[PDB]
Structure formats: structure tokens, C-alpha cells
Amino acid sequence: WNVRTTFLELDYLSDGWITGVRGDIVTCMLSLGAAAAGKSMTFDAAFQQLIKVLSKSTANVVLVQVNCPTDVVRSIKGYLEIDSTNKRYRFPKFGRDEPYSDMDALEKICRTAWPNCSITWVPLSYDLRWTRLALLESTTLSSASIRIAELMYKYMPIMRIDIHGLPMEKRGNFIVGQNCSLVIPGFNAQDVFNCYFNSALAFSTEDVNAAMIPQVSAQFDATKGEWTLDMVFSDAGIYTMQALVGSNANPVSLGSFVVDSPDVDITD
Amino acid sequence: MEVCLPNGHQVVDLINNAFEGRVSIYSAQEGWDKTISAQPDMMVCGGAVVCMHCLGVVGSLQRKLKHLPHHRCNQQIRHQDYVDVQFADRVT
């Protein structure tokens, strides 16, 4: 090899080695669930252990594939089954089993470890760019398999943690049609916000009434120096936020949040 | 310039000298005098001079310091982490 390329033979959830490695961006994909199932532990304990070992590292960005639902819990017949009483993902195509947890627990763990981090849930649904890694490798694709992959990614997102980020807080119930609030600190009275939903400008704060969301409002408090955003959503999904400060042409990026569909209980 | 932490016995000496009302505290606006209250910048712990923004040993009593010497500071210590010793010193 031409540049440094090191291979180490040791389990990464054990202690005594993270002091002595050099890195800034950490990648863990499709390994945490199987490792946690092998040692027969809950997903919360596995995530807690992983964050404990990564606390002492020198990383700046963490990219972890996580077992956690970002919508209502539903079963995809033949490809994934969800057991809710005992939190359990079952994969019948491979005959495998893994545990899973909720967004609240993981967010609380990360916020305890890094008090001012920014957590984003990478949106890959509705996007066709990853196809560049398939058609250009002499591989044949079909549309139905793509849809199955989208629906499976709905429950296995990539959590991206930026260690030195901008805190913000969620208040209301992020459900379709309800009232949900954002509290954003560390900004002045001349700043601008804008939200994005699948590469389309959902709303902004420069022109409040020109939004595409049913109801948006924004207030500023000077004593607390905080922006309060009140919103009522219409479509479920994952929304991203950006902030414009002063006259800068490069916009500082905040995290992202997930808006959920209403209940699915029907009777006759 | 890079700095290191103080030892245990120096912290013990700081505590003992603090609950007795004799700490020497440096504030930029006030100097080495402790008549007028201010936010601390340097503190003398067990024969060493430590910066109060990171708690890393920045000098020793053997030399005189006009103001906070240039160094590398992580600046991850806030005023609510050590106000207890200031309270003890003022009250005593």
C-alpha cells in the first residue's frame, strides 16, 4: 500500500485499546446488531458500551447503522418481522435474529455523553444516487427490489453524530396534524432558518406566510436568546434544518427530525 | 506552550489553605490583590500557579508573573466548577 493501511485483530467493544488509535471519522455499519445478539445483550447496553469506548477516542463524526424504527411499527411480510413485546427484529431470508430499541433512549445516551452534539438521521429514502454504485459495476437492478430496500431502510437508519455541534430541543408530539415545537439557542435577532423535505424547500423564516406547511410561526426571546418555532405538519418523513447567519453565503447545518404518521387502528 | 495537571498533595494544600482564608487569587483587572471581588484567572495551589480556565499548572512561585502566560488551553472549565473554593475563601 501507498498510505497508512492498518488491520487489527481484536474486538472493538472491549476496553484498553481506544487510547492509541488515530482517527477522526468513525464508521460502523451492519455490525452492531449481530455483535449485540452474539453476546446476548439488549441493544441499549450495546449502544452504551460502544459510546463508552468511543468517548475516549479523538473522533469528530460518528456514523453508526442502528436498529430503531423511524415510523410506526409494521411488519414486511417475508423480509422482516417485528416483535414488539420482546423487542426483536427477525430476518427470515437469512434465518437471523437481532434486538432493537427506540429513538428516545439512543438520543438520551448520546446527549449524556456529548452535551453539545448534533444528531442527524441520514435520509436515504426517495433518493436514487446510490444506484451509481450498482449500474456502473455491471449489476442489474429492478424497481420492486428497490422499494423493498427503501421499506427496510425505514427501520434501519444511519445515525450520524457530530461531536461539536449545535444543540436544539424538541417539545411537542411530532405527529402528522399535531403541534410540534423547536427551541434553538445560540442565535441573534437577524438570523434565518429554512427546512428541507426531500430536496425541496418546505418552509423558511424570511417569508413565513409563503411556506408549504399547514402552519408555521417563529418567535425570538432576547433574555434567553432563543428561537421558538411552532409547526403543524402534514406529511410524515425526515426533515432537515439549516440556518443562515448574518450575510454569509455558506449556511451552517443543524440536525434533523422525524415526523410520524397517525395511528393505524381500524375497526368495523 | 503545553501544560500538565497538578498533583494530589497540591490540591490538598489548596483546600487546607482555602478553608483558612489565605488563598492568593489573580484577576486581570485587579492584579494580585484580593480586596475587590472579581473572576479569578490564576490560583496558587501547593507551591504552583495554575490557570483557572483549564486547571493546568502554568508556573511556579520561583518566578514572578505579570499576567497569564501564553499557553495552550482547552477552556473546558466554567465558573460553576470552582466557585465553592472562592465562596469558602471570601466567607472565611
Add this chain to the structure above:
Amino acid sequence: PGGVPWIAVGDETSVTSPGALRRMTSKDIPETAIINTDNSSGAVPSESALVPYIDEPLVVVTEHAITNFTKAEMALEFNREFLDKMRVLSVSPKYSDLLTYVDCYVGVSARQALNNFQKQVPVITPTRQTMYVDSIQAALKALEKWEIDLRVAQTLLPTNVPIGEVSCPMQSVVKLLDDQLPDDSLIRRYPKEAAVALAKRNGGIQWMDVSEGTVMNEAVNAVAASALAPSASAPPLEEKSKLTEQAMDLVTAAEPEIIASLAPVPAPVFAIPPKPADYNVRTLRIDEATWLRMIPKSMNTPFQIQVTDNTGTNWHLNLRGGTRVVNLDQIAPMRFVLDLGGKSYKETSWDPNGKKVGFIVFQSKIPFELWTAASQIGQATVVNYVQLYAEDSSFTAQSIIATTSLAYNYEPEQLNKTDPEMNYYLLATFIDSAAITPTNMTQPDVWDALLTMSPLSAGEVTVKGAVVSEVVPADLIGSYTPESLNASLPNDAARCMIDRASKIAEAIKIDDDAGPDEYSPNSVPIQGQLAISQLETGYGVRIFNPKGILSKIASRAMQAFIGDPSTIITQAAPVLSDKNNWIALAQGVKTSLRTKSLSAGVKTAVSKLSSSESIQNWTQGFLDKVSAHFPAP
């Protein structure tokens, strides 16, 4: 080339595999046998019944061996006259007449040898090589007394001058040498042989020829002399080369990269043979020595316990307030020796003479502070004990204890260590077959005595009193106050680092000769770092200094390092506490040394020349004395 020769297995000059080659022997080359030796040295027997006829292998002789054995024979040739006088080895061995030149395959293994065909290689058998070495070794053995007497004759008076030339009439030298040389010496018996040998060794001694008259230099080693001789402006070449090579060896031994690492390094690779250390356990302060424990003071209820050693004998002893013990966990193997000599322990109610002091080891799950009423003692036995003796003391109306060497070895492997909860303690105190009444004996212990600890391992390292598996050498810089250095254990990492850095200090002092406040190639690495650091942005007031001030500060830093090599460890050191300066200096030493081109310093050269001229003047004065007190006819 080296190795062994190889031949074909009989194939018609078509060798296309390593399976068609076999190793050559003396049957394939009959001239290498034992019966074909020229036997000019008479070593091989001439009787045909005594010379064996068997097949020996062959090996290849390389040019290095040829030249070195050829010079070994000329070592013998320096004394041909005396060797003739004893009828020993009348014909020179002439190594080159033992080898046999063959065109063959050369190598150690067949696969390599197959692809390497060489012409005119010299081979020999082990037997003939051993015979040649034996002949030279015997000739050397026969000359021990003669060489010693020759050296005495040469060294009786100075025959070498550091620089220039001196002189004296030879008749005076001969008279002095007759007067002073020992009677046992062989010089008196065989003068002319000694004269010729000395004339060969030394070019100064020249013997006039009676028949013709010509007197001329006859030494055989002028080239080496010119390599040793000093020019009138510089030192000799060989001395400079030797000094630089020694400095490079010290730098290599010091491992400059180990002591500058920014990543953890294992304990066995970092360690070195340690040294014992001495302490006074009573005089130590508990918050500084993290490896001691003490029962809380102001306790007003002394209690007594009983304990039995490995022979079952019962012993009584008492614990009170102030008693101290030592943690025997997480300190690696260690040997303790305790000596009470010079202390009194005398009261009106108790006298030490005739009493016994012992080491007692405790195992319990309860911390030593929370001990009372003997119910918390746990499992315990007596390890060792010794009886005291009293003698008169310098202070009037007092007496002192004679010497002791109470010893104990602590090896962590034997003890079970099953329950992490379990705690181990060690104590030294009085014991007696009768219960010691608390009123009579009030001393908490006998820890007021000299204590020597010596490590029992070489792959164990602690920090501040607790063992670690790895260390970061760049993280020990400027992290020890002086009080924490007189209370560490002998297997500490600070001592290892200091001893490793002492070699760098020695190498720098050997190579460099600079006065106070003078720049040197070994002090600019700190200067560059200081400049770049003073430009940067941190927190606090910046101060800018020119190049002169920075050069002076860097030079003072290097001098303070050389004079005292433990400043790197010491906390709040002025300039050497920063890790960047240490790393830069350690890395720059190698580059500074490797790029010398047969050179030295100006001050060294000038002082050396002045010294040598003074030496020649003194030598000439002494020779004038000799020629004046032993008149020539």
C-alpha cells in the same frame, strides 16, 4: 561468496533442477585430502599407518578470512629471531598454500547454488583449517614471556612523543636499561634479537652497520603511524573516528525513538535493570506515599491479637492508634529489607534488649482503618522475626539497637487473589510469647527504621505506586513534583526514563564542546520550536523575543539538561517541561551525529595541540636528564 561447493550428480552438463546437484567432497577433488598436504610444518605424521584415509567435506573460504589469517601470521613474523633461537616453526605457514581453486557451484542450499556458477573459488577442509589455526596458536603460545619482557623494555622509558621529535645518545639509554632492567628478563640473555625486534617495531631506533655504515629507518608499520600521527593543526584521524563511533553507539543504545513515543509502549520493552531504594516509612507523609495505610489517629482503645507462623508457634502483639501498614497489592514482586540500627525504642516500662521484631502479613476484606477488637483481623501469619541486642550509645544515659537485616520476599503469583474484595497488608512490630501490656509498650510499630526495597522483576512498571501494563513516554514529561519522586517505588517509569535519557546526555557531552551561552547544533532544535510556539495563538498575553534571546534560552535549556538529566520529569521546569522540546531534541540528536564528516571542535583542537607540545617539552627534559646522568664514553 561463501557456503559450500556443489557438483553435478553426473549429468551431461545439463542441470535444470536442484535435484541434480550433490555436495562436493574430497573424493571429487583429491588434492584437498589429508595425504596431499605439503606438510612443511611437520605436523602430519610421515608413518603411513597413522595417517587416516576418509572422506571429508569442503567449505568455501572468503576474502575476509584470507586477509585476517594472513595478518595473523605476520603477527608471528614480528619475532622471527627468537623463534629461530628456539628452533620453532622454521618455515612460515603460508595460508595461501592450503586452499584449492575449483570451478563449481557455490551456495548454502541447492536451490540457490543451482542458479550461481562460479569460477576459481578457493575451498578447504575443516581438518586443514584446524591444523593451520593450531600451528599459529602454538607459535603464539611459545612467546608469552618474551613478549612481556619486550614490552617492559619498551615502556621503561618513553619511546613515543605525542608530537615533534626528541633525541638522546643511545649509549645513555643502554646504560640506563642495563642498570634498571630485571635480572629475570630474557633481554639480558639475548640482546641482539631484542635490538632487531625493537628496531622493527619502532622507527625511532636505528642500528648502525659495522660492515658498511648505513643507518636507516627499518620499521614495517609506517602507514598505521601516519594514520595515528597528528598534523600541526588538527588531531589524529583515528581518534576522531573512534570518538564519533562511540557517541553513535551510545545514541543507538539509548533508543531515541522509545523515549519519544506518542502512543502506548508495553512495560517489558520500556524497562531496564533497576536499582534498590531506601526509605523511612514512619517519616513519609501518607498523602504523598499512595502505597501506605494508617489506622485513624486519636483512637483511645488499644487492642491485642495472637498469630501463628508456619511452625505453629503462637505469638502475641498489639495494634494501637497510629499503626501503619503497606498495601501488598498492585505493586509487582518486591524484596524488603529492614534495619533498625541506631534507634532506641527505650522506655522506663519496656526495654528492647532480648525482645523480638517480626514481619506479619494480614489478609482481610475490611480496610485497615476500620480495625478494632481483633475480630476484623482475618487470616494472618508471621513470616519472619529476629532478636535484638542493645549497646551503649553516644548520648549519655541512653542505649541503641544493634544492626539487623530482617528480610521478606513478596511474590504476587503464589497468593490466591481469588476475591478482588480481599486486601493484603504487611507490618513490622514487636512480638513475644507473653502478652504485651498496652501500658508498658506504647510505640505503634517499629517502622522507624531504614527500609530497602529491591524489585524482583524486570518486566513490571508502576506509576505513582500502582502497576500499569503500558506507558506513553511523551506523557511523563513535566508531571512529577519533587515530593512525588522521593516516594515512588524502585520500579517506577520515571527512573527508567531518566536512566535512558542519561545516555543521550552523555553522547551530547562527548560530541559537543560549547561554553556558556554559545549556540551548538544540538541546541537549535529547541530554538525552532520556541519561535514557532511563540508565534501561535493560545490563551493569555503573547511575548515576542528576537533571535538572540531565543538562542540564549535554548542554550541554557540544553546545559540544564546535560548537568541534571532528571529535569525532563520534574514538574514546572522552565523550558524542558514541554514535550515538543524533548521530542525535537531527541530526534535531532541522531541527525546531528550522523552528518559529521571526520571533524571536531575548534576549542578541543587548539587545547589538544597546546597540551601535546607541552608534553614533548617535558619528555625532552627527561631525556636530557637521562643523557646527563649516564655519560657516554
Add this chain to the structure above:
Amino acid sequence: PGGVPWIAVGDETSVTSPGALRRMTSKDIPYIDEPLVVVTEHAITNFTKAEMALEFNREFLDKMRVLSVSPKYSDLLTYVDCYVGVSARQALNNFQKQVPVITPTRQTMYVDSIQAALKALEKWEIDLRVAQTLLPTNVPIGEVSCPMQSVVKLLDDQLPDDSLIRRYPKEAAVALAKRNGGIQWMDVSEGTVMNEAVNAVAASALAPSASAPPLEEKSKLTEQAMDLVTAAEPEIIASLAPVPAPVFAIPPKPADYNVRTLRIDEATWLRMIPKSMNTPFQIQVTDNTGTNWHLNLRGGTRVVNLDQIAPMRFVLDLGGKSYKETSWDPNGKKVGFIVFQSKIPFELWTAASQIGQATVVNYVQLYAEDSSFTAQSIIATTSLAYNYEPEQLNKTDPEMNYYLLATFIDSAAITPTNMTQPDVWDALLTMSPLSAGEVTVKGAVVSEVVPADLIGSYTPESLNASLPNDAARCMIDRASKIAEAIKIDDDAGPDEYSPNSVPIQGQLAISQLETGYGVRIFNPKGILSKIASRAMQAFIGDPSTIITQAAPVLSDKNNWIALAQGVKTSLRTKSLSAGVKTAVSKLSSSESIQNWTQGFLDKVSAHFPAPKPDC
């Protein structure tokens, strides 16, 4: 040859010509062009030896399917005719045919291939070393034997469970046969056995003869002795002329003193107020942080003087002292250093007007514990630290005087009648130099020193009260190496003349024959031989005798110079020789070790018994 090859750019060439030469590149041999480098002979030979170091283990390297083809360094070298040299002038003066050249890329690939093989062979190498070391396979002299089946049984018995020999026994056998010519394996197909070793020259170099030690040991010992004496630098320590301090000094060592117990007349780096003043006084001193401390001065107070002392570090320890008085208690008190600088001498001080500018540089708190004696308390160990670096002070004005004091301090005024102790100097002080290029004599810095006058001048007390950077300690540490080298190079017993003691004898004879003041005396040669022998023995047993005053023979200067020159002129004229007693003792010891090895092999054969003869 060496350096690089060159090519003439023009027809016109001479010894010293402008231009006329350009460096050769890969274009000029028969795109990327790289430079060429001329390869010497030393590199070729050493790299070939390195290759055969790998080739010892061919059978294992072939079982594991690595290193199918050998490196063969002599393929990579290209032979060409060209100007050769490091610079253009040297190339112009030289011309050689068939010099070998190579490019850096190929050399790097070659060395990387060797290193990769050596990395892959490591565990195998350690395993063979363990197998060779487990039982004695070498003997200093002679020949011992043991049945092979018993040996293999023992190896199978005691070898580790992960040893790679247990997986490849035949390859390990062949490897051991290659390394050691004692282990021979019979050829089954023909029923013949003989030595199959490839190392038979170094074996002869390392082998004793019937009556003499090995050559390698003698050569190594002589080279070591010469290296030690060369490092000792005889010319510097024999000089009769001034030599600069940076040249003479070598890295110093700490020293331990007690200030109170020293006497004033011997030690000239101390100043004490006269005891006739009879009255105390008290002063107030402000430290660097503005704190006020009150301390008291009285009669008998001692201070270290900092004027003519090199940059030095003081560390003080009070452990074991009592300092307990009727109206004072050491527990909870404070002790510190004070640095005075004033224009009034210390002995004249009577009032606070004389104390000059003062500052409490450092201070600690005293903690006391019960001691061995009854109703007695002693102080815990302290390490009070100060670094006298002169250049931080104002040394421009000459009238200034500097002093150092160590005593009790307190925030309140100290009552004179409570404490009558002058200071705390009655404690163990450790001084360590900070400058390795400055030297003092008898307590004052000297610009240059004369090595021929230090010898035979110090009384024992003066040598005791020396500072760590004294020139005498440099002299001692520079003569100790000569002493060690002579001891390595000699085996003379009591009263036996040796080539290392006779220069003193010649000097003594000449001095005896001279005329001088006093009652003249005469001696034979035997008495002088004995006297020289005793003097040399005393020197070897104690290198600190040259400087001690009124020494028997070594206090003189001519004797020292003669000995220093004799060391070189004796070591340089040896021929691979050794002492008679050393030789005979080595022979007897080697034979005893051989007997012990043979007995152990007999024990090994008794257990692990070999199969009985079949028929």
C-alpha cells in the same frame, strides 16, 4: 570507487575544466528517468551474507510456500565504463572501467524483500534457538557425547506445546545440522554419516587450542581496553598548560551536605554573622504574590553565598530533626527559602536597614509525628527546591552581594524568646549542577584549569567540602577509566613487576640520581620495583589517590605523566597475547566445565533410556 558516474558533455577535457561533465541517468544505458549510484564492494559482500542468512532455512521456506526464488544481489548491478566520483573535479581526475551501478528504486525493493522474509521467519528462528538452548549443545573445550535417541526423547518431553518443531521435525533436524556440525544425521539409503555444517571458519576462530585461549577473545579484550583509554583522553589530563573548562568538564553528579555541622574555615562558600552580636531582630519580607511573612535573624545565622557559584539546584530535606523547644511546636509551622541581595556585607548586618531586597522564593508546611524516643516528635520528609540561575538576576553592577537563607516563616511576628534556633540549616542538603561546561576550584569558578597542578593538593577535609562541579571530581572520573583499562589488561599479583608499573620505576630511579636539597639516599633496582608495584596497586584500588595530599608516590607530577603515557605505549604494542596465569586458569576452568557437561549428559542418558540393541 564511490559517489556517482558522470559523462563528458564535450570533447575538451582536462584535470580542472569548467563544465565538461553531466550526471548519468537511465537513458544512457542502452519515460521515467532516475539517477545512478556506484556500488562499492563492502555493500556487495555484506548483502550477500545477509541473503545466505535467509538461505539457512530453505526447507522450511519451501514447506510454507514462500520465497521461491532467491534475491541474488549481483543481478541488480549494471557494469559500465565512466568517470566516477562524488564531485566533478574528482570525476575529471578519475576514469575506471566496469564499475557497477544501480538505481534507488531497485535497492529499496531488494532490501524490502529481504526484510519481508526475515519478518516471516521470526517464530521459526526463536523456536530453533529454544531447541538449541534447552540442553547443553556447546562445550568450551574438548568433546562430549550422548546418544541421540535419548536427546530426541527429552526434546519431545519438554518442548512447548505450540513449538513449530513439533509440526516440522525433519526440517528442524536439517536446520540444526546446518547450524551445528556436532548434530549429524545418518543417510539411510547408503548408511553414511558426516559433518554437514556450512560454518567452519568462525568455528576455528572461536575454538581454544590445546594450551592457549581463543584468538577472538584476546582481540576483543585488547580492542575494549584501547577504546576505554582513548575515551579517557590521556593528553588532556596530562597537560602542563591551561585547558578551557568546557573541554575538561564531564557530566556531574549530586552531592549531599550538612550545613550546620560544617566548619567555616574549610568551606569557603558560607557566611555566618559573628556570635558576639548577642541581640536578635525581626524583618518582614514580601514574596512574588504580595504575601507578607515575618522571620527573625540573630547571631550564628549561616547563609550560602551565591556569587562565585555556577548555576546550581538545591533540594533540602529536614526529615528526622526535632526542632521542638519549650515554647515552640514544629507541627503546623512553615519553613522557607529567602534570597537576599544587598550592598552591605553580611557580617556587618545589625538592623533591618541592611537586609536589602528580599524575597521568599519557596516555602512549605511542616508536619510532625511521634518518633522512636519517648515523648519526642520528628518532622516528616520535605523537598524544598531552589534553582540558582545567575543570568536571571542583575549581575551588571559589581557591588551587589547575594545570599541564601533557609528558616522559619509565619504570617504573624515571631517572638524572639519563643524560638532561639538560628535557622534550619541542620538538615540534609542535595546540590546538583545545572551547567556542565563550568568548573570551580575549592569553591570558586575558574575560567581554565591546569590538570598537572590539581594532583597532590587536596587535604581530605578540603575534598569533602568541594562543590559538585569541582575540577577534582572531573579528574577522578577521567582517571577511573584508565584504571579500569589497566585492570582489564593486567593480572599481576602482589609485588610482581608488570609493563604497566615500570614507567614509575624509571622516573624514581632518575629522580633518585638527581641532586636536590635534603639528605641523599640510594636504593637498588629491586626496591624501586617493589615501590612502583605498590604505587600502581594503590592507584588501581583507589583512583582518588593522585589528588590526595602527601601520597606516597602518586602525589608527584612526573610519575603521573609517565604512567599516563606508559598506558598508551604499552597497549599499542601487543600481538594477540594474554597473561600466563590467565591462560592456565582459563584452561583449567574450561576443562572443569567440560566435565560437568559430560556428567549432565550421562544423567540425561540414564533417564529417558534408549532402546536396547536389537540383535
Add this chain to the structure above:
Amino acid sequence: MGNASSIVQTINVTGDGNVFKPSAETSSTAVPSLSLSPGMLN
């Protein structure tokens, strides 16, 4: 070493006729060191 078996072989580690006879004149070295000084190699 160890014990083994083959149908055809050349040497017998556990067999008879092998020699183990250490000697002073034989000794055992491989390649303890080499001289690779920067001054010598250029």
C-alpha cells in the same frame, strides 16, 4: 522433535546411527551480526 512415518524416507529422526557429539572445534553460529556502518557503505 517428534515421531512420524513415511513409506519412503531419507533420514530417521527417531532411528539409529545418528550422531550427537558437541565439540569445541565445531561450535555453532549462524549470522549474529553484520557491519553496515554509514561511513563504510556509500
Add this chain to the structure above:
Amino acid sequence: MGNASSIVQTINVTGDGNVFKPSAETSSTAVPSLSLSPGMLN
């Protein structure tokens, strides 16, 4: 490297296009020491 002066006829010290690429393989060496032992010269 030379300083405080620039000359561009042949080698411009302060010009563009120069390389400063330290490496472990290239290293830096001179002639520190040689073999001048008395027994080997003769």
C-alpha cells in the same frame, strides 16, 4: 538553505518549483567514521 539573497541564473533558492520531501528511505548521511585500527592497516 541559503537565505536573505536570491540568484536565478542557475539555481533560484527563493523560486518556484523546488521540492522539500523528507523521507525515511532517502535519509541523510556523510562520512562519520572509518576503519583506521592499527592491526588492519599495516
